[PDB]
Symmetry: D2
Subunit: 391 residues, 4 copies
């Protein structure tokens, strides 16, 4: 059961040394008692023997073991944040002349890494609609090396048909590297590697940390792709500090109870918004009628608390301020996955500008909500008060 | 005076909020009270206004201000470790078709980033002897974009003639990006940017942290190069956690008193080794006769505690174990810059393999020492006991 | 009902403490700098009133936690301590002097009892005991020199729930000026609103559910207006404080306390209901289980349950049987403390309990097993308990 | 001489605590897991002897610090506390009972005095006072019920150095069983080897030089074999402990303590020598300065100096002059505490000192300025002091 696995993942005596949680081992230098010990550590420098702090200490090894168990992978690479995990995981598998095929709903920093970093290094990026399904086969080029998924999509929440995409990729380019940004699912509500994806990337910053106070990225790879991910990310110096690794392991322990509350509350809010006269559409993977909902219901084991909705009109700048500046419980901030409820707004042309080679299908102002752990009736009252400020 | 600057750098009330040290602000989400506040934060997202944790919190801003003051730069980018700072700082300034010209004594992970990451991205790397001086002009190609220095060199400690190198580069390619790995000097014993270098990179892991228990990289850039460094490293997701940033600021406060002890002790050990019958040569920038010593004496304001020496013979594997396995105070580990004294050995062919397009000029076993804060007569007794095990 | 969830998310989070982040900043300090003599004078006058003065009085991080605890427990001030045992010992010490008498429940946490019998006694302060179900009959035990009446509901290990209204009313009838204190750790200070019942001070080992992850230690004591000044100043004369980082982690634990406690309640009551039907169980002590001692008071006076409870086996396990039972669990771990995400198991023989029930005997003869029910899947925990039963059948 | 530098680098760093790193691991815990009943029994028997048992007794991180402190101060055990004031109050409390008497130097840290007069007095323990230079004449003040003789050398604020050998010899002549304690904070426990002088317990605010950076609070008390058991168990009954992270940071501070103290000594003595020649200075109180009170004992009994000292101005500054002086320093900051990298300044009027010198009067009439000399360049600090003098001339 997932709840039991979350409580126990990565907690072995060699890391915990008698406590419930792993020790925090802060180190660059790791000491070798003999030349033979140093030789053994060198051979096992990527295999959980203490060698050098850039490879990790006991605290990192415990987190890596936990992530491999929970996401069903052969190895887990750690990064300073989610954006670093995305950028460096893609970079690890490309070279001049390669092509990346990325969903047009990818997180904007992921897109900007492709267009502003990869392109000048001779790696091209093409784009696809998140509902393309089996038709992605027609976009695979002779030089396509990476297929990059993100389900649900950033902001607009469209859910891919991963089985159809993976089957189509494997028909044309069996050896391609299929990656997913699996942050919304916290890597546990969608078991990406069981669907034939090669690498599951997360901003552990979000639900794994769970409290809006650490930043960290993870990438869990299958056996085919692990060695290349591990060694190439290491050549870029990617690692996380021991204390944040500890706080990520610690966040896992409450992830199940947190996610269940985020699901229950956010679906309640989504159902209520969907009936509301000031709401044109609700984008929540768990809400019937949302884009790709059928695939969410089939392929995921739950929901988190992040979603969006489109207002029945385009707010003026004055209305945007009246709406956003006067919430009592929702806070305006970037990021999500914590205990606090958050709100942000985007105009349609803002979204169109981050949907490469595509237009948007709405004209009202889009509101993205993160539903935290507050009482849902209090959150509904805050949203209702906001509606009254713009009616 | 440097000691007063080290105590005070980055400590302004807006970061310290009443304490001696900056507060530790742990955050991904940073809250905007109004739409206008969010617009202001966005405009100032790289200029010390709270915007998003990947850009930094008050704790990072304090460290960045300190590093800019101490190294005389326009901005300071932060990284998860020194290797990440090197890799990402080079990457920030190259594209397909560019050429990098790097000292053949560069830190081995820096070389491996160039040969294993850059090359397949269409960026070539050429090499130069660290004593090339003005003759580097003959190696500058039409596509040379970056000139990468490291003074003293890794392991073998050769000191560049930076004024001669910089003048020759500026004669041929005034616009080239000149970078230095300035870790041995802790960025303060050699004021790189005052010599016309564009970017000074450090593994803050070493002397800035000072205790072998944090990892972090920094890169301080002049005004010409800052915006590109800042934005391109950010697109790779590079950052450090708030707690390590705090521990780096904290390490600065004792850096002066620590470095003076490392200098005094390590020069004493070097002078003693230089008289010893079992020692063929001593590689210490502060020791008369060492390679580039004249430039160290002219261009640096002190020494740290890392150096090497060559034994009067090539140790067999049995002798290596007898020597290294039985020290009482020196420990075998990678890294350096802490309070503990460390020892490592390399055979000549090991060094030759990390001197691209060059051979080594010694045949004895090379021993690298980090001289910590222990009593120097105790360290000398430990070294003497080691000599007796191999005589 | 989830009534408190919004309060838990927001408690103590004011801009002066968070400075733009969601959580309070961590301000590590002994020295706190005064920019001017005028500022030093103001900080001195207000050194116990939330102006930065000296690290021993607190930094912004402590002030934020103190505000959150006062809001959640409805107090006038919150004193902080290195652990729950320090909170108990120092809160009692803050209100006693030579010649005074303490009246304490005989189900009090053992370190609390030992503080009374081994420290207070040699300082001229005597301690008497009462059965946890004494209710209004406590009036007969109050002496003219009784200064402190010390409650703990549910009781340690055996889980008996006081009739707090009856006890408080009797104390106020006989000794209105007495200081009534409660160790409110099991309720995490929020499932039983002690200060609303006329208790003067609610003490918690924040170590347990507030931290919630078995990795910090900290005590809190929230006092009403009548008692705050004496608690604050006398604990400070003993140098009592907590470090800023643990204060931050306690505030952080508050944010998930509601969702955690609901799961601990649901899972532990399921386990208790199953044990109460099991042929190898003689008795189940869970405040939320009908028939448990003081359950009617729990039902009336609490807003929920946590996950700690106990049960009595049908026999006293020998040392050998205790090893066969405890050494071979797959999910439960043997450890002290509780309140975390992990399920824990500990055994107490009946004679061990009797020795920590002063002036009383136990009313059971089997080994008592104390369970902390964590966040694991409850069916997996039941399978672990069932396997344990098979090892001792 | 740097004799202790190797010991400071290595103290407490054993493989069982460091597990491959240079520094001890940070083990955060309340619960400590017992794999078997046999392991729990062994941990219980050895719960005060460095076996993992419960977070309140310590984790590996605490054990490493305790080992380092016992090595450096030459003791049998080291008890840990939330701050220096908690160490003083709880170490004294651990050895007194109703009817006992404490004999304390009148230059003791004010919170230490207030603990005696405001806490101990109401528990039946009386306190008497002695001049710090009393030496062998202390014998006349020892009563049949004197249980504790409490030293502090140099004294707080005014810096008087005891003749510890003379005091100890007199105490052992009259009351051999008395518990002699010293607050050894100024020496960081290493510049004065208190236990080698026949003192029983050396107490430190590790907050100061051991932490060394003004950002952690922690008290330590290192006891000889005679007194360790009572200190350990009675402090534990008061719940006294420190968090694992602050213990780690204290161990970490030890590693640079030698290099820091040498700079504090060099710089502060230079400043003291300059002040002693300054026309606006009436007196300099620095143990390392010839002519200072008890300097001959400092020279004989200490292995070095720290950076805290004081001086008396040629006049008492009014409130207005105090602001002009203190508000406008560029490098010195106004704050309590000391022992860090930053230079600090605080003023005490002569009448303020007299009020904290029980049964004594002060022998100066100017404002007393206490300086902590940090790691800044000493010529810059002298320029800051010179500018201050110009503002009050
Ligand atoms: C938050 C976000 C990221 C980036 O993570 P950071 O830790 O903020 O760098 C990556 N992917 C998704 C889907 C995100 O929402
Ligand atoms: C240590 C080292 C680095 C790498 O720093 P890390 O923090 O270990 O990644 C970079 N440059 C030099 C010269 C080094 O010695
Ligand atoms: C745990 C316990 C305490 C002691 O708390 P510590 O933080 O471990 O000192 C106090 N009261 C109760 C009811 C406890 O169970
Ligand atoms: C600072 C001080 C103390 C108190 O230490 P805290 O950690 O601040 O409680 C004790 N003794 C002396 C001599 C002091 O100066
Ligand atoms: Mg578009
Ligand atoms: Mg070569």
């Amino acid at each position: 059961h997932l709840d039991t696995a979350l409580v126990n993942a990565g907690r072995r005596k060699k890391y915990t040394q008698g406590s419930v949680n792993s020790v925090i081992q802060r180190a660059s230098s790791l000491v070798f008692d003999t030349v033979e010990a140093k030789k053994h550590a060198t051979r096992n420098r990527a295999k959980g023997e203490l060698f050098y702090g850039r490879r990790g200490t006991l605290t990192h090894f415990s987190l890596q073991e936990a992530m491999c168990e929970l996401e069903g992978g052969a190895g887990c690479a750690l990064f300073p944040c989610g954006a670093a995990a995305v950028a460096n995981t893609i970079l690890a598998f490309v070279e001049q002349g390669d092509h990346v095929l990325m969903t047009n709903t990818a997180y904007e920093p992921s897109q900007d890494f492709c267009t502003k970093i990869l392109a000048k290094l001779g790696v091209t990026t093409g784009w696809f609609d998140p509902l393309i399904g089996a038709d992605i086969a027609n976009l695979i080029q002779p030089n396509t090396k990476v297929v990059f998924l993100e389900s649900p999509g950033s902001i607009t929440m469209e859910v891919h048909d991963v089985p159809a995409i993976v089957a189509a990729v494997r028909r044309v380019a069996p050896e391609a590297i299929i990656m997913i940004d699996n942050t919304w699912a916290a890597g546990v509500l969608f078991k990406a590697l069981d669907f034939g994806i090669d690498i599951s990337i997360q901003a552990a910053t979000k639900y794994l940390i769970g409290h809006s106070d650490g930043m960290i990225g993870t990438a869990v790879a299958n056996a085919r792709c692990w060695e290349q991910l591990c060694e190439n990310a290491y050549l870029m110096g990617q690692m996380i500090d021991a204390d944040t690794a500890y706080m990520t392991s610690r966040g896992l322990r409450t992830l199940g109870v947190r996610l269940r509350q985020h699901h229950e509350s956010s679906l309640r809010v989504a159902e209520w918004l969907a009936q509301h006269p000031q709401v044109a559409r609700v984008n929540h993977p768990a809400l019937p009628g949302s884009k790709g909902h059928e695939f969410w219901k089939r392929d995921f084991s739950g929901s988190s608390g992040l979603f969006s909705f489109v207002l029945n009109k385009r707010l003026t700048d004055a209305e945007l301020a009246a709406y956003l500046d006067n919430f009592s419980l929702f806070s305006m901030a970037y990021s999500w996955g914590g205990f606090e409820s958050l709100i942000l707004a985007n105009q349609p042309e803002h979204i169109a500008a981050i949907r490469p080679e595509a237009e948007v299908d709405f004209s009202g102002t889009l509101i993205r909500l993160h539903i935290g752990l507050e009482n849902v009736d209090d959150l509904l009252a805050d949203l209702a008060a906001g509606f009254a400020r713009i009616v």
